[PDB]
Short mmCIF file of C-alpha atoms in Angstrom, two decimals:
data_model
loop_
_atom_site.label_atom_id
_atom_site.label_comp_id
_atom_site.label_asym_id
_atom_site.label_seq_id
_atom_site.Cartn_x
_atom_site.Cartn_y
_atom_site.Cartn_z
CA UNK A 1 282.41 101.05 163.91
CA UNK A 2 281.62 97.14 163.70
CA UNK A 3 279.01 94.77 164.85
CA UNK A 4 279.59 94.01 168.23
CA UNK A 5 279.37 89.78 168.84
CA UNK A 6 279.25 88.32 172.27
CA UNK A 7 280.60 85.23 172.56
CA UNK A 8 281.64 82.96 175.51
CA UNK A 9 285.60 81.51 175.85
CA UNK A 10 286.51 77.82 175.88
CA UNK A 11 289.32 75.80 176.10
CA UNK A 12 288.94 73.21 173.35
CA UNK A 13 290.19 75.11 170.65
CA UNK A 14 292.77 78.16 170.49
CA UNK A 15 290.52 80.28 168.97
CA UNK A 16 288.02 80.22 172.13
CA UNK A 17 284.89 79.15 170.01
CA UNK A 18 282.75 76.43 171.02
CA UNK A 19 279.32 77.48 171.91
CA UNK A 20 276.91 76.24 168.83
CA UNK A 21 274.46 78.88 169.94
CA UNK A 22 277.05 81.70 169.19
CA UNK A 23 278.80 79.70 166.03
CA UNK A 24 275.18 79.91 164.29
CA UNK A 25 275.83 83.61 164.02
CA UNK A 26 279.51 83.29 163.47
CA UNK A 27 278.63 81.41 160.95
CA UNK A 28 276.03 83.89 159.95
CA UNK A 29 278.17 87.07 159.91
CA UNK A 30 281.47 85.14 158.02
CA UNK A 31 279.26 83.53 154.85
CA UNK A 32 277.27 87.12 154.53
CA UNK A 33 281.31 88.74 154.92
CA UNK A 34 279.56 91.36 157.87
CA UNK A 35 282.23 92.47 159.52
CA UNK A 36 282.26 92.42 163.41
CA UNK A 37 284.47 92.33 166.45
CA UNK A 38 284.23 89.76 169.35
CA UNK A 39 283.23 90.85 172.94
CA UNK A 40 283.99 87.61 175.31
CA UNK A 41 281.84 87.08 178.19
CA UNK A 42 281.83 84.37 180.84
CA UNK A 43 278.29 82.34 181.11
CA UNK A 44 277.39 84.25 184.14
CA UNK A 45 278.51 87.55 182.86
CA UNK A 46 275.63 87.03 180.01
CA UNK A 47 272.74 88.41 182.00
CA UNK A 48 274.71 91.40 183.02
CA UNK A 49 276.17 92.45 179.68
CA UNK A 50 272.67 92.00 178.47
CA UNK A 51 271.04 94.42 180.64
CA UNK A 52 274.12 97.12 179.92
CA UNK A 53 273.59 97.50 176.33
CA UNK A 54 270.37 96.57 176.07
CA UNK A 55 269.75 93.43 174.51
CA UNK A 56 266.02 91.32 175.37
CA UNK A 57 265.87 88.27 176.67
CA UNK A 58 265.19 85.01 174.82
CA UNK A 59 262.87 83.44 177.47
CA UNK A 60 260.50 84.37 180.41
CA UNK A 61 260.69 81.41 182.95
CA UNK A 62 259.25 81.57 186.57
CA UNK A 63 262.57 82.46 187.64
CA UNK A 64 262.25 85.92 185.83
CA UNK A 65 263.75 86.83 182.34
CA UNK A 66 266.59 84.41 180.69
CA UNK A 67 269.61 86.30 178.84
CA UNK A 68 271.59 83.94 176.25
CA UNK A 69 273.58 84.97 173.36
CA UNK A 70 274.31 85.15 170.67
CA UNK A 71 273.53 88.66 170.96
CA UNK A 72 274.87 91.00 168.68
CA UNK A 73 275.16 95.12 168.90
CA UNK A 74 274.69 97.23 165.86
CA UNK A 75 276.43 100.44 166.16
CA UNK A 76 274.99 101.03 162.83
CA UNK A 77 271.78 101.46 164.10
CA UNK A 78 271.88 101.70 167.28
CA UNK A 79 270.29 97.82 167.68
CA UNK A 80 271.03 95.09 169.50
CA UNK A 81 269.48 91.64 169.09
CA UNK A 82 269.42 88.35 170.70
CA UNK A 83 268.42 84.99 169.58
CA UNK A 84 270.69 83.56 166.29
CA UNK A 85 266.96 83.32 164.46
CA UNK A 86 265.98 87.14 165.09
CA UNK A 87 269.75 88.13 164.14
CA UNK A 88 269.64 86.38 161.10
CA UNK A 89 266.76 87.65 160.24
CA UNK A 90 268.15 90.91 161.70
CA UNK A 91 270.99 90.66 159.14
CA UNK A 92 269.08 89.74 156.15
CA UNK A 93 267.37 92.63 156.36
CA UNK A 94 269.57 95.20 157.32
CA UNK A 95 272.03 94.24 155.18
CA UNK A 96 269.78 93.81 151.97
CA UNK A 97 273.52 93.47 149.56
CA UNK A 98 274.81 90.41 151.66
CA UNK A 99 273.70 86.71 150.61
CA UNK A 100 270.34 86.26 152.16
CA UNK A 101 270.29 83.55 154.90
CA UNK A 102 266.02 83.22 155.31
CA UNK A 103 264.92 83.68 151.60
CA UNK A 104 261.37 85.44 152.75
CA UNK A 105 258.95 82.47 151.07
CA UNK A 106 260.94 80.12 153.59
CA UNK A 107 260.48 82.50 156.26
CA UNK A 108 257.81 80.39 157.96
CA UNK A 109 259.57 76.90 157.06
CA UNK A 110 262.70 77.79 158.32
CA UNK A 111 260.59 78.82 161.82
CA UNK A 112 258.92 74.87 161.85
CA UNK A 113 262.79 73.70 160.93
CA UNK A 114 264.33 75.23 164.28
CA UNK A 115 261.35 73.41 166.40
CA UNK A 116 261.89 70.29 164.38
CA UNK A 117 265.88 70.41 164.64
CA UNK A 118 265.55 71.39 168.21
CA UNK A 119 263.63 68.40 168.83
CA UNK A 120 265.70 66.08 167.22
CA UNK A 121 269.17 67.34 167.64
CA UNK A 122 269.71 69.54 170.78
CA UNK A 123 267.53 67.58 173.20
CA UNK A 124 269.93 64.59 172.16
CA UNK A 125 273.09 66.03 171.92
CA UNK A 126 273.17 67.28 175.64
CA UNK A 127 273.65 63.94 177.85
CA UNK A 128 276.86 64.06 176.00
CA UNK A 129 277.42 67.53 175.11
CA UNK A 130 276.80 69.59 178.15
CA UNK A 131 279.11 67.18 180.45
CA UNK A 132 281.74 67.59 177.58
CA UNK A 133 281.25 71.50 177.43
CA UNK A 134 281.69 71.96 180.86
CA UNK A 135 284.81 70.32 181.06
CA UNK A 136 286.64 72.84 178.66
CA UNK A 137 284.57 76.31 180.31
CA UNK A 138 286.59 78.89 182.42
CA UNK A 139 286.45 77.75 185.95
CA UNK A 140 284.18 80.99 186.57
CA UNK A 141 281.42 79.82 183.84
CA UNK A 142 282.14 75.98 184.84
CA UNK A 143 280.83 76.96 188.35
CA UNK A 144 278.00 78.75 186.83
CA UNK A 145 277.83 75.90 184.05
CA UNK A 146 277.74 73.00 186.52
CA UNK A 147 275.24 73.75 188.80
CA UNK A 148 272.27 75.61 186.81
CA UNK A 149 272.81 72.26 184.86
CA UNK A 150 273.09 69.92 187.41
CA UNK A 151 269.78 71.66 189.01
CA UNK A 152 268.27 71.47 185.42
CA UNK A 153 268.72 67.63 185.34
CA UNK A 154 266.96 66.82 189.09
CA UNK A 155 270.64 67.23 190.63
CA UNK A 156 272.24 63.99 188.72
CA UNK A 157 276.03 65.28 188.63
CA UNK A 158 277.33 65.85 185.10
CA UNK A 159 280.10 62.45 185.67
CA UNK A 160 276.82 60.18 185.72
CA UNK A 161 275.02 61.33 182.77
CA UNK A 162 276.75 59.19 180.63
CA UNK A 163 279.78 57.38 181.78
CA UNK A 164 282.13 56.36 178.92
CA UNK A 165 281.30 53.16 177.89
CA UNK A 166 278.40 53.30 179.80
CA UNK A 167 274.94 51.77 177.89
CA UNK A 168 273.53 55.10 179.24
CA UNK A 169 276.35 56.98 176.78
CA UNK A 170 275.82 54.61 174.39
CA UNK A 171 271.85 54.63 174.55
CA UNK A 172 272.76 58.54 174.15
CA UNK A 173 274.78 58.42 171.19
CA UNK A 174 271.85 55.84 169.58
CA UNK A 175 269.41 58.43 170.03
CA UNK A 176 271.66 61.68 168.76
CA UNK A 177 272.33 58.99 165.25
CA UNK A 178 268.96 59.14 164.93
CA UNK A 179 268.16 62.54 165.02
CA UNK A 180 270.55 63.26 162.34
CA UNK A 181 269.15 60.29 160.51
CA UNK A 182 266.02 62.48 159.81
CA UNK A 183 267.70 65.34 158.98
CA UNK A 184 269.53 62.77 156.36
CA UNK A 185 266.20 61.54 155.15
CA UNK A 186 264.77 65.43 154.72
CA UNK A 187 267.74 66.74 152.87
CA UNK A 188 266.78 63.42 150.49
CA UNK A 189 262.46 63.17 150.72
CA UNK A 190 262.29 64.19 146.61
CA UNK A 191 265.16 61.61 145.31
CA UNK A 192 267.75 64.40 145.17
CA UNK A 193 270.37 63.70 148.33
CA UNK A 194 271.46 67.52 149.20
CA UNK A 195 273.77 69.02 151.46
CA UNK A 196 271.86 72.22 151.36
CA UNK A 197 268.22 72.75 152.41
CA UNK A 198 267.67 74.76 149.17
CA UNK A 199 269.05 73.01 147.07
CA UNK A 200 272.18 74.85 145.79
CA UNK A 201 272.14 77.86 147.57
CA UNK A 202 272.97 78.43 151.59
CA UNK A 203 270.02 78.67 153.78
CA UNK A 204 269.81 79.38 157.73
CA UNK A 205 268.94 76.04 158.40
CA UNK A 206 271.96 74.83 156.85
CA UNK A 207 273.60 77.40 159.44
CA UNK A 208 272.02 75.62 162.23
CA UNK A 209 273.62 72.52 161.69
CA UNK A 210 276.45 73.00 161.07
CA UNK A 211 277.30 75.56 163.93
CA UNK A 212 275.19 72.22 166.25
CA UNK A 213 277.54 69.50 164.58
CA UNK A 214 280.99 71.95 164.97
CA UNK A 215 280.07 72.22 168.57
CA UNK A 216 280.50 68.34 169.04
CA UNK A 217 283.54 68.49 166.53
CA UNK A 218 285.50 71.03 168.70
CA UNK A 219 284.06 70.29 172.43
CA UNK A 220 284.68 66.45 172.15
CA UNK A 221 287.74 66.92 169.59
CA UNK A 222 288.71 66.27 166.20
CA UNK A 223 290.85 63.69 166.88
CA UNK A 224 288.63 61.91 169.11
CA UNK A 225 286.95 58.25 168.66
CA UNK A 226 283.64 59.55 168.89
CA UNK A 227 283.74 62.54 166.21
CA UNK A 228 286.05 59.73 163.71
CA UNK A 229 282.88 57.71 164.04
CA UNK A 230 280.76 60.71 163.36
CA UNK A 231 281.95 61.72 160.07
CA UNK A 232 281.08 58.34 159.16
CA UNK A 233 277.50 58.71 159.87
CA UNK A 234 274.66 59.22 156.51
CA UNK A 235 278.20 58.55 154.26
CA UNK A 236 279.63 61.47 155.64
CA UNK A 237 277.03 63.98 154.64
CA UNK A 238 277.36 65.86 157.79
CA UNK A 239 281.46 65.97 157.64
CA UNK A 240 280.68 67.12 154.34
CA UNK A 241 278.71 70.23 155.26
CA UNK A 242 281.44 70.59 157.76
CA UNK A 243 283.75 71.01 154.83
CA UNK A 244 281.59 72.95 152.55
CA UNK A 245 281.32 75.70 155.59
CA UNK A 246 285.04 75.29 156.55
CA UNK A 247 285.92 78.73 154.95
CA UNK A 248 283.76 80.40 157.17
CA UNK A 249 284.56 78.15 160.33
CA UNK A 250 286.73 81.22 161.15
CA UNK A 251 287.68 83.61 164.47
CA UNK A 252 288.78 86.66 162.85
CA UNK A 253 290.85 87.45 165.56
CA UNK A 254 289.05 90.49 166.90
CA UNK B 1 240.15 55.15 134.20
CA UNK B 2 240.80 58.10 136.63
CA UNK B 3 242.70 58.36 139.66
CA UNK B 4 241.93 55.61 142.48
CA UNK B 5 242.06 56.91 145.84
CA UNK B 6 241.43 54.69 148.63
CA UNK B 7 240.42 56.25 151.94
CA UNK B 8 238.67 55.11 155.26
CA UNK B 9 234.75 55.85 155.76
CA UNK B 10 233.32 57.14 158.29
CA UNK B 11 229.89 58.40 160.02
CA UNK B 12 230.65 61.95 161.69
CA UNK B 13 229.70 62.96 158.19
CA UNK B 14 227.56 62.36 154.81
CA UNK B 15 230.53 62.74 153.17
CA UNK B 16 231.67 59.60 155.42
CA UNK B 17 234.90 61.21 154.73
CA UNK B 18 236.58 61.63 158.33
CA UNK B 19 240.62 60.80 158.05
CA UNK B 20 243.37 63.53 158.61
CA UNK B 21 245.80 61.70 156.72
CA UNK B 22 243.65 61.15 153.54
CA UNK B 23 242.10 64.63 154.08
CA UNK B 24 245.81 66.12 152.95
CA UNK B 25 245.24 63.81 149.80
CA UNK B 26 242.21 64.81 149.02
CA UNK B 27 242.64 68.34 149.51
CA UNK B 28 245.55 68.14 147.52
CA UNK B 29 243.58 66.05 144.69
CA UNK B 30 241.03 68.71 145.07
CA UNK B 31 243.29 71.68 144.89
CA UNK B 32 245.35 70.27 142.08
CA UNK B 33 242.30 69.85 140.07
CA UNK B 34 243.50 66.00 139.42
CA UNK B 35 240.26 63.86 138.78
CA UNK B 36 239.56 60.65 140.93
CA UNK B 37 237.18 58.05 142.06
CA UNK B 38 237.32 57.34 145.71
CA UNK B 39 237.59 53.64 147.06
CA UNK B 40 236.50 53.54 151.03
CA UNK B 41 238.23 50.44 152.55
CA UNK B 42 237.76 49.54 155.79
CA UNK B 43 240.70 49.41 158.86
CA UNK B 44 241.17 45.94 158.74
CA UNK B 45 241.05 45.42 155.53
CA UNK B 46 243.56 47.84 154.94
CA UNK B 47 247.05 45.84 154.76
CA UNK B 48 244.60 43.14 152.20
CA UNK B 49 243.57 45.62 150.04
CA UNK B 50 247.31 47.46 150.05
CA UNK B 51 248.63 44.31 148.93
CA UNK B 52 246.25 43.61 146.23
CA UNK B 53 247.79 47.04 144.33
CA UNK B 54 250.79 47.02 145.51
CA UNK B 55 251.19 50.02 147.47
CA UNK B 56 254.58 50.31 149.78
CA UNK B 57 253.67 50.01 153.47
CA UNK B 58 254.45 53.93 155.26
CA UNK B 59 256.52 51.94 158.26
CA UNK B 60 258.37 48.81 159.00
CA UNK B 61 258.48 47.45 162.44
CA UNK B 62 259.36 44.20 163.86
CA UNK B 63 256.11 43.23 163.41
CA UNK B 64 256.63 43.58 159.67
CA UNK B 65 255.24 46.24 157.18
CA UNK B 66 252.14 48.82 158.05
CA UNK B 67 250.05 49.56 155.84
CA UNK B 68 248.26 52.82 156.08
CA UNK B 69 246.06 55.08 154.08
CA UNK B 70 245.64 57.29 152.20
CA UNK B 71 247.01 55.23 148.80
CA UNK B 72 245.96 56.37 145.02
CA UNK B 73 246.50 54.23 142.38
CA UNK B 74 246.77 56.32 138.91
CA UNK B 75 246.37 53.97 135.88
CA UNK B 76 247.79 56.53 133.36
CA UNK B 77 251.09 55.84 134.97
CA UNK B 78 250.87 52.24 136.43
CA UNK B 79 252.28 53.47 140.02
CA UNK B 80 250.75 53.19 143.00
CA UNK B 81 251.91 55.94 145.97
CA UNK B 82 251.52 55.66 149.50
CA UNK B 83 251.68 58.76 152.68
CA UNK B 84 250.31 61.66 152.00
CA UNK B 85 253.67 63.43 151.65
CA UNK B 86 254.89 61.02 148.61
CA UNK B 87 251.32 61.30 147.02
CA UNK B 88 252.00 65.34 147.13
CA UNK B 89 255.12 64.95 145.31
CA UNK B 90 254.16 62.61 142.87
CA UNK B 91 251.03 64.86 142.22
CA UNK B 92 253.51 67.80 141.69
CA UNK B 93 256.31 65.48 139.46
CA UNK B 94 253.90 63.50 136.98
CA UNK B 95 250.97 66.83 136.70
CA UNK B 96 253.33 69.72 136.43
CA UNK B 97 251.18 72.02 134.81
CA UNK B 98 248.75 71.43 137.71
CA UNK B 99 249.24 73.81 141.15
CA UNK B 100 252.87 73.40 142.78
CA UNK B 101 252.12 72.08 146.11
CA UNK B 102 255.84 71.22 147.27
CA UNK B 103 258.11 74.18 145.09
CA UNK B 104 261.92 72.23 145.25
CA UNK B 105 263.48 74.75 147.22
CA UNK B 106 261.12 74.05 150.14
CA UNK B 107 261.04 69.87 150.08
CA UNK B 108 263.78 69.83 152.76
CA UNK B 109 262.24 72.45 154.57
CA UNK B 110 258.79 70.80 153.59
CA UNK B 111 260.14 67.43 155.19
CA UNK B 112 261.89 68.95 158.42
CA UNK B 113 257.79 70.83 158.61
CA UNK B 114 256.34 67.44 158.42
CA UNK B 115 258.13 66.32 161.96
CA UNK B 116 257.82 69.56 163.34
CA UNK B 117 253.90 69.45 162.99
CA UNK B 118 253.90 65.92 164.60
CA UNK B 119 256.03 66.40 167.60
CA UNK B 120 253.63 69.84 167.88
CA UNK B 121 250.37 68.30 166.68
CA UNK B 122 249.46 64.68 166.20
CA UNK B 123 250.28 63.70 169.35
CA UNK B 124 248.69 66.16 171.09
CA UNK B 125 245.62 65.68 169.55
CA UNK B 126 245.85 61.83 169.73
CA UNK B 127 243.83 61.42 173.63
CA UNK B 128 241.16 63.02 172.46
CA UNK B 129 240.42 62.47 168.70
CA UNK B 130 241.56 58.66 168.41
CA UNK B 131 238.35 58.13 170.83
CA UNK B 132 236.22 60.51 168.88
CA UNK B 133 237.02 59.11 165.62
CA UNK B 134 236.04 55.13 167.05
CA UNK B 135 232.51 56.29 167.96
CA UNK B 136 231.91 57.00 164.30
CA UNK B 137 233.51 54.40 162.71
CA UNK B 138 231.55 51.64 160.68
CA UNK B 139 231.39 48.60 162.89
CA UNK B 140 233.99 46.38 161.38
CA UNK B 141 236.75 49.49 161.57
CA UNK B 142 235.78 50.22 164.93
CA UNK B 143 236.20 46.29 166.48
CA UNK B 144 239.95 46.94 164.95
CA UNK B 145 240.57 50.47 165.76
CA UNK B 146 239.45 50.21 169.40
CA UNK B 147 241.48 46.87 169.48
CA UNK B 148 244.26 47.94 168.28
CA UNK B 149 244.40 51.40 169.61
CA UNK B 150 243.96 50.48 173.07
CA UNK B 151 246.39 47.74 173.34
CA UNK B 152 248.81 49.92 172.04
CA UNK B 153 247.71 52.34 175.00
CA UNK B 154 248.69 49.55 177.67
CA UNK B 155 245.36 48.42 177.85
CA UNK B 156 243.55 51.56 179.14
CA UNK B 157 240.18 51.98 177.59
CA UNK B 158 239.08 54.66 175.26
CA UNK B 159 236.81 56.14 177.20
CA UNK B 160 238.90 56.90 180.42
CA UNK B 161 241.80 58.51 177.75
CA UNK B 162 240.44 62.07 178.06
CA UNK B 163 236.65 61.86 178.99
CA UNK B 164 234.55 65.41 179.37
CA UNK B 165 235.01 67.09 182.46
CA UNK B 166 238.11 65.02 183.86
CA UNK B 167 241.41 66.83 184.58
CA UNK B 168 243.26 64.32 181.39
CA UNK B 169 241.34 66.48 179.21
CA UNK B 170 241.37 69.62 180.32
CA UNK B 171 245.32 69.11 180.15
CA UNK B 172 245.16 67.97 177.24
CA UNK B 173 243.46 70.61 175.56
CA UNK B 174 246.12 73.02 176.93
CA UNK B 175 248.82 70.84 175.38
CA UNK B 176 246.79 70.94 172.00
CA UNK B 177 246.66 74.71 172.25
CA UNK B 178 250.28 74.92 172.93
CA UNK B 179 250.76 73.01 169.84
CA UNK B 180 248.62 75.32 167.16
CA UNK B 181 250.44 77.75 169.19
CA UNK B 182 253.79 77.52 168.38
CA UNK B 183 251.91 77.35 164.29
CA UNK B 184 250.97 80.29 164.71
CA UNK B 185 254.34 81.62 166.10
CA UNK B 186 256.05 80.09 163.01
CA UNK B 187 253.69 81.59 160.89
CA UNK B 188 254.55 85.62 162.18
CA UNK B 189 258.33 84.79 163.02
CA UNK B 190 259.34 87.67 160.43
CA UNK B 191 257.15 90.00 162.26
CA UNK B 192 254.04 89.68 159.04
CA UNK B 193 251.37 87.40 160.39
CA UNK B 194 250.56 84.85 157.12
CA UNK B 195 247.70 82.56 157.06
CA UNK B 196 250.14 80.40 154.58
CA UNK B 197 253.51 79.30 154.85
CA UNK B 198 254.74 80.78 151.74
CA UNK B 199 253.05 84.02 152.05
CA UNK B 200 250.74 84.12 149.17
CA UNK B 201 251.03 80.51 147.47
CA UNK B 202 249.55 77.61 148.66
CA UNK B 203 251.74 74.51 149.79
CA UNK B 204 251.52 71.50 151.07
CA UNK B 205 252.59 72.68 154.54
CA UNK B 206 249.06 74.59 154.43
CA UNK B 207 247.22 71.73 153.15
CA UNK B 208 248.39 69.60 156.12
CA UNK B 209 247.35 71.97 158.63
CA UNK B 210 243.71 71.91 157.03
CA UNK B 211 243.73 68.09 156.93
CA UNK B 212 244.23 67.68 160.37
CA UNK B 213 242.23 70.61 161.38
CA UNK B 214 239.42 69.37 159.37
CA UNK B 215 239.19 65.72 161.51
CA UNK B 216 239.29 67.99 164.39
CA UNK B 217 235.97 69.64 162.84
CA UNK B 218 234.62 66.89 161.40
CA UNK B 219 235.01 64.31 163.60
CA UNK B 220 234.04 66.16 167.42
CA UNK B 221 231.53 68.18 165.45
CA UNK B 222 230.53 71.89 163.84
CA UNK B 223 228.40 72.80 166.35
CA UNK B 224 230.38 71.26 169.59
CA UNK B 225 231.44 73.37 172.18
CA UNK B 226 235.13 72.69 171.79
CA UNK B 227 235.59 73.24 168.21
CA UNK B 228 233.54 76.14 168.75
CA UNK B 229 236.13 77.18 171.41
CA UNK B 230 238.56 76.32 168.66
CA UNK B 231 237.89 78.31 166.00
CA UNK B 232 238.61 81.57 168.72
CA UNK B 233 242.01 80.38 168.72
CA UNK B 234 244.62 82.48 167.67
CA UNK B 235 242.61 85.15 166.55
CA UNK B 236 240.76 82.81 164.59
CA UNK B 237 243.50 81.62 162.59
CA UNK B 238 242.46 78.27 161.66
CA UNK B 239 239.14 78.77 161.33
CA UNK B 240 240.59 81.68 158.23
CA UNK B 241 242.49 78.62 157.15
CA UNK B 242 240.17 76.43 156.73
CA UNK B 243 237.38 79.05 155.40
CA UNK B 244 240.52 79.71 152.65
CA UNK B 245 239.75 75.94 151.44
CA UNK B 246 236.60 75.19 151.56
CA UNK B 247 235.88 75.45 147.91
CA UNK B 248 238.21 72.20 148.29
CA UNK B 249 236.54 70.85 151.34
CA UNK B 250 234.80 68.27 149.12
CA UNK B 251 233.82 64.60 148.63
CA UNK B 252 233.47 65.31 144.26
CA UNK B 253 230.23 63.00 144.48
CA UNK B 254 229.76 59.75 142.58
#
């Protein structure tokens, strides 16, 4: 009996997988070859399924406790854990034989990299992202989707965020180029221009980006203008991660 | 024929050494065991004396290059290195057999820690220290600091930033604490509560903790109620951290 991994449907892809939160730990589970089977929830299902099996919440907010998955279910053990970060480190440990994600030395740095990358990436990619998202949910999680997000934003409707070919869309897109700019200019601060946070071997962080950056590949489409202009971006170093990860950019097909 | 290293006097201290950028130098110079002499430049003269050695500017804005401190000049090698961060890694890359500060599978992760801290930290601490640290700078430095500083504050005066007993600072305390707060989450994200990032080796992600810490200390005073307050914080975890170095905490006397 498997890991159990909760995961919310889309329509961009066949497959179903969008969410960046969840594709950290799909991500996660394919490179360490865990095996697991995929539980699909609808955004306001989360909460629910959350207090059924047991799984904390990843926030307290004035509003009461905040449910968001990833959250995984080890049968195993009889665990279940939320937040990609804790499940990695979850995995790691439980799972001593696998490749280890958050070499224990790094423990700490990788803790400052999630602030740092949440400051720099996620903030950034959501004028764009979110509307985009939102447009490919289930009409039940759109509902849910469109107006927690809506309210989160001071009520501005997700079609005025950032118009295409708006300057607010484009002031948007200036703003998520430079976020990735610093990641560009940490994976290169000593001279040696990586690809991987280590060095040569995979690290959590590395995760992290790439299930951020497949997000925006799948949600606003391979094919699209905006994503063909995004591989271009640092020389391609983040369509290269892309590739290096593309054998574990898989949906086993529960 | 040592080690130059230019830095910024000051007069919260007889050491008249006050800075939390050239603090990370010097600890590091202190903790590496590198020799040096120390040159104390005033703020104006900073960008004159830069230019005189050569040292690369740490920014480039419209308004041309910035030059900040702290810079070291080593004459056994001919280069001069500016920021802190690039004088760690030379330190590590021309005196190997001196104390790793910046191990290469961390200089990504070191790098991505560097922004983290100052989205957390600097900024935070900005309304109230860049007014303490004007009252004890040498005449000269403080004509240009206040100058400069307030004029890039829109014009508001230090003094009305964050003065004693207003509501500004009281707020801004609590956004300082925040900050050292989520430090101290990064620090126990694995569940073991370190006093370093590594675990049991020192880094440079330690060292620039103490630096800033040690303006904080310096600079508002030992024996002020706030620092007072401040070592509490956290179950005292910076004031262990900065205890931990003070065998480096040291101006080596000339």
């Amino acid at each position: 009996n498997v890991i159990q991994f909760y995961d919310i449907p889309g329509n961009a892809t066949p497959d179903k997988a969008w969410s960046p939160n969840t594709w950290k730990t799909r991500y996660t589970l394919n490179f360490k070859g865990i095996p697991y089977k995929t539980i699909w929830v609808e955004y306001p299902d989360i909460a629910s399924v959350c207090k059924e099996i047991g799984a904390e919440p990843t926030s307290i907010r004035p509003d009461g406790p905040y449910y968001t998955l990833p959250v995984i279910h080890d049968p195993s053990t009889g665990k279940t854990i939320s937040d990609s970060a804790a499940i990695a480190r979850y995995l790691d440990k439980t799972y001593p034989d696998t490749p280890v994600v958050i070499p224990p030395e790094t423990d700490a740095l990788h803790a400052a990299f999630n602030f740092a990358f949440s400051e720099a990436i996620v903030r950034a990619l959501a004028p764009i992202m979110l509307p985009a998202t939102n447009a490919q949910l289930n009409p039940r999680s759109e509902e849910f989707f469109r107006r927690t997000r809506e309210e989160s934003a001071g009520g501005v409707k997700l079609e005025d965020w950032a118009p295409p070919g708006s300057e607010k869309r484009a002031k948007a897109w200036e703003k998520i180029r430079a976020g990735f700019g610093q990641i560009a200019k940490w994976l290169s601060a000593d001279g040696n221009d990586k690809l991987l946070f280590l060095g040569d071997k995979v690290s959590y962080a590395d995760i992290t980006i790439v299930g951020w950056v497949i997000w925006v590949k799948r949600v606003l489409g391979p094919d699209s203008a905006e994503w063909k202009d995004f591989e271009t971006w640092d020389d391609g170093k983040w369509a290269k991660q892309l590739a290096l990860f593309e054998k574990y950019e898989v949906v086993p097909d529960a």
